[PDB]
Amino acid sequence: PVCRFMKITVIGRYGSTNARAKIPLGFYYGHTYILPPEIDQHLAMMVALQEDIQCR
């Protein structure tokens, strides 16, 4: 799915009466390529960034 806005809902426990607690946010994975500047110029800066991080 091409997602831009994300929403989270929670469902409490009938046997739980606590007011404050911590819920993990988790991890999200997704790339930024959409096709049924995505043209080959998309490699121009990705390659430079890869080379810089390879030098590092």
Binding site: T17, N18, A19, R20
Partner: protein
């Protein structure tokens, strides 16, 4: 009651004990300051009599 209420009651017990201690220390401090002032006044009164 609840976990927060249970914490409230535990800290109420602890603070009531420490407030017993605090009342004792504060009354002792007030009495000590009173003895301070009255000893100074008694020394000054003896000096004035002399």
């Amino acid at each position: 009651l609840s976990s927060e209420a249970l914490m409230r009651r535990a800290v109420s017990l602890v603070t009531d004990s420490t407030s017993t201690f605090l009342s004792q220390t504060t009354y002792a401090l007030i009495e000590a300051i009173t003895e301070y002032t009255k000893a100074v006044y008694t020394l000054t009164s003896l000096y004035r009599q002399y």
